[PDB]
CSV table of C-alpha atoms in Angstrom, one decimal:
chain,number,residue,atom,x,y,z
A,2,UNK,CA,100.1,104.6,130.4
A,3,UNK,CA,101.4,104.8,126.9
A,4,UNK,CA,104.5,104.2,125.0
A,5,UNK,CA,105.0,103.8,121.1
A,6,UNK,CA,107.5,102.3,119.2
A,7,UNK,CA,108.2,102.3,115.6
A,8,UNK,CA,110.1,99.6,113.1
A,9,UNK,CA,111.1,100.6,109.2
A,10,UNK,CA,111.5,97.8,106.8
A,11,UNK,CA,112.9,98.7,103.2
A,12,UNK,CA,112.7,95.6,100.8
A,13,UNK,CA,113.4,95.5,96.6
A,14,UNK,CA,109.9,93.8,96.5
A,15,UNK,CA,106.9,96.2,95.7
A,16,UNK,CA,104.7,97.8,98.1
A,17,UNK,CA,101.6,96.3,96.0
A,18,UNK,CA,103.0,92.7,96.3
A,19,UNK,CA,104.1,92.8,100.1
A,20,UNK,CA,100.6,94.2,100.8
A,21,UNK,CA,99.1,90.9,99.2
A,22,UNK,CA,101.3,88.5,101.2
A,23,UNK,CA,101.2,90.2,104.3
A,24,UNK,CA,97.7,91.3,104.6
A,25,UNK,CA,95.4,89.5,101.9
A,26,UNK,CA,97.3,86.5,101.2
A,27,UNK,CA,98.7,86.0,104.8
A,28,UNK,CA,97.0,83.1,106.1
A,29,UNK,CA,98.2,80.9,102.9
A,30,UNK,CA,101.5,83.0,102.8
A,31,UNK,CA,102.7,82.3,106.1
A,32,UNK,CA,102.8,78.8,106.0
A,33,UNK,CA,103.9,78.1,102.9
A,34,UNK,CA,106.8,80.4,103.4
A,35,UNK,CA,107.7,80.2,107.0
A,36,UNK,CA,106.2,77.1,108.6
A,37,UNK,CA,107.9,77.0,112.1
A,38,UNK,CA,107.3,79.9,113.1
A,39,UNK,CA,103.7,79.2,114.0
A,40,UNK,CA,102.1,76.4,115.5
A,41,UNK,CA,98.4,76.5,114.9
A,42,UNK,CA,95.4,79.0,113.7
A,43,UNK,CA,92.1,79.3,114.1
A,44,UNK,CA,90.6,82.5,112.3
A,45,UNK,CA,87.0,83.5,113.5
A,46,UNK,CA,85.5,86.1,111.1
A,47,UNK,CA,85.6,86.8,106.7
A,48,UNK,CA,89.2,88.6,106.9
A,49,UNK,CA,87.9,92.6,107.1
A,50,UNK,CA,87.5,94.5,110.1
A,51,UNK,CA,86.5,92.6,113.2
A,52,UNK,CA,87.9,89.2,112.3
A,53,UNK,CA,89.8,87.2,115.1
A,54,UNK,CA,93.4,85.2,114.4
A,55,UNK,CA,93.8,83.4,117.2
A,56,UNK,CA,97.8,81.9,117.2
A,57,UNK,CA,99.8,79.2,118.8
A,58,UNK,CA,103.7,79.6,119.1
A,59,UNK,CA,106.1,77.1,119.1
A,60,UNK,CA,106.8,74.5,121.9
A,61,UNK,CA,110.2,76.0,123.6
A,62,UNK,CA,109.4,79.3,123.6
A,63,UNK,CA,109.0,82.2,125.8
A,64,UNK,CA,105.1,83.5,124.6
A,65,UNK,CA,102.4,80.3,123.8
A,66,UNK,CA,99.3,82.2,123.0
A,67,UNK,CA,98.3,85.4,120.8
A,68,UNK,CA,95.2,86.7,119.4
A,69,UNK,CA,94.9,89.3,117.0
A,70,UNK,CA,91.5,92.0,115.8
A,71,UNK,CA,91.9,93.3,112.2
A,72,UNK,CA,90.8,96.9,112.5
A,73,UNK,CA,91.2,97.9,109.1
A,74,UNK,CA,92.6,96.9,106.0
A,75,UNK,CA,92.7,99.6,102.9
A,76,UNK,CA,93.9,98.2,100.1
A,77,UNK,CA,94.0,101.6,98.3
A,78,UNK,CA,95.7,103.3,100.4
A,79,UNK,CA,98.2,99.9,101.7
A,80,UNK,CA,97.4,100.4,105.5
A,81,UNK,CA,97.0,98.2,108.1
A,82,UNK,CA,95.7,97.7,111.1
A,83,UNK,CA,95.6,95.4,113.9
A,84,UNK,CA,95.1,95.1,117.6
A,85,UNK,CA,96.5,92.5,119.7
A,86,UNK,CA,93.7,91.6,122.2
A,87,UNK,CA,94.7,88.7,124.4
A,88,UNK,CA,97.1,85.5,124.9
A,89,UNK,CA,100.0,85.8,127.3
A,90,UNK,CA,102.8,87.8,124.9
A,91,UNK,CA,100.6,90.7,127.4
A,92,UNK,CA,102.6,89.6,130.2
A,93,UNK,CA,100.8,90.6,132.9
A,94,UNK,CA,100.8,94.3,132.4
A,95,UNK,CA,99.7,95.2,129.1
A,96,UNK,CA,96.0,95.6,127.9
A,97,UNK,CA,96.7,95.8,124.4
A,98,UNK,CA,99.1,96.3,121.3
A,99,UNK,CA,97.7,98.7,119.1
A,100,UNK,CA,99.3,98.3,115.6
A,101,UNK,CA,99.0,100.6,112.3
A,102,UNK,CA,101.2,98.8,109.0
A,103,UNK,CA,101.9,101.4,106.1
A,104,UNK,CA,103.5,100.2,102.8
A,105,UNK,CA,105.0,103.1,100.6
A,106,UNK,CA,106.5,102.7,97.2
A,107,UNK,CA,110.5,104.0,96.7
A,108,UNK,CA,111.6,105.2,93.5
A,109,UNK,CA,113.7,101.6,93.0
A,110,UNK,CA,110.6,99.6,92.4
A,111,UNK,CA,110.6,98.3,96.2
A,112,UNK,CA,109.2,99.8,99.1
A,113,UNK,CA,109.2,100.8,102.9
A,114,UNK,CA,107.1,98.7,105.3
A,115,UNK,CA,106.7,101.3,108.5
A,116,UNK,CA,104.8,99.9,111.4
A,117,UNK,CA,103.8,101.6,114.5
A,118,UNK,CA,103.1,99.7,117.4
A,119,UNK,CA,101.1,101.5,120.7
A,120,UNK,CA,101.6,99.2,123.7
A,121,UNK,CA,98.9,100.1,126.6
A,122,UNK,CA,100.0,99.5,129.6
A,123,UNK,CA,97.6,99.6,133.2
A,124,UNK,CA,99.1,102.3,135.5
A,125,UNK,CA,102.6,103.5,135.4
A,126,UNK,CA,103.7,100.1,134.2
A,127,UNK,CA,106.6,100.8,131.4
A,128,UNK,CA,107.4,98.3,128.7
A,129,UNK,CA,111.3,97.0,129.2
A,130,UNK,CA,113.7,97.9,126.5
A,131,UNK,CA,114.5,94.3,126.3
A,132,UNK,CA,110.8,93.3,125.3
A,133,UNK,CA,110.9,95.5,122.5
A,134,UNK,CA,114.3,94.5,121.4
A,135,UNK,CA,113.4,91.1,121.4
A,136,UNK,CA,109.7,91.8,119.2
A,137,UNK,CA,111.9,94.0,116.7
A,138,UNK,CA,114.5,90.8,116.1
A,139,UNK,CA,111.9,88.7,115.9
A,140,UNK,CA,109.6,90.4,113.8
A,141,UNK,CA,112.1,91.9,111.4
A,142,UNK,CA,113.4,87.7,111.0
A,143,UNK,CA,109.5,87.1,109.9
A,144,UNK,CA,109.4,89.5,107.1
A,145,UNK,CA,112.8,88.8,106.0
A,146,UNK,CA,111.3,85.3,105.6
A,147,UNK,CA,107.8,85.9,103.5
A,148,UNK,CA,110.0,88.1,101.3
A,149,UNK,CA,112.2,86.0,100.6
A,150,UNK,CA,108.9,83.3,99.3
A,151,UNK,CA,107.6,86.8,97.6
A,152,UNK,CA,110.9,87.0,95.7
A,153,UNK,CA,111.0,83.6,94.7
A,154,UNK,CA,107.5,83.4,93.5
């Protein structure tokens, strides 16, 4: 089946500059600005459409693999997207996470970062609420990091 879950992150930083250090600038961003929270990377592909990120997390933790497809990046419109294709955050009952990013400007000279993620799941099989509780703390402490690296440079 399918199930879709959303997550809405309002910063003071612009939606231009987030853009650049999330998407563009990520793979120079990331580590500079929140180095443990990766292990390693190798990236297969330019950056555009079709390019593979294939991640290592941390030692103690509960996921050690992930790898990630770009499906589109439009830096007009400041949209996103990415599918995650394999590595064992998938559990054993999810094909694949598809993910659309879209960056809009507020009138305070920041912006709202709202992501939509589409789990696929084989069969019935229903993603637990405690799976996506613990992707939205942990994604939300991410961003809260690179920002703060955006703000300060």
């Amino acid at each position: 089946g399918v199930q879709t879950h959303v997550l809405e992150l309002t910063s003071s930083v612009s939606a231009e500059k987030i853009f650049q250090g999330f998407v563009i600038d990520v793979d120079t961003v990331l580590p500079k600005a929140a180095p443990g929270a990766y292990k390693s990377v190798e990236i297969k592909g330019d950056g555009g459409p079709g390019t593979l990120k294939i991640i290592t997390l941390p030692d103690g933790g509960p996921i050690t693999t992930m790898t990630l497809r770009i499906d589109g990046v439009n830096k007009e419109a400041l949209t996103f997207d990415y599918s995650v294709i394999d590595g064992d955050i998938l559990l054993g009952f999810i094909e694949s996470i598809e993910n659309h990013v879209v960056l809009v400007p507020t009138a305070d000279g920041g912006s709202i970062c709202k992501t939509t993620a589409i789990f696929h799941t084989k069969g019935d099989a229903v993603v637990p609420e405690e799976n996506i509780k613990y992707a939205n703390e942990q994604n939300t402490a991410l961003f809260k990091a690179l920002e703060a690296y955006l703000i300060a440079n």
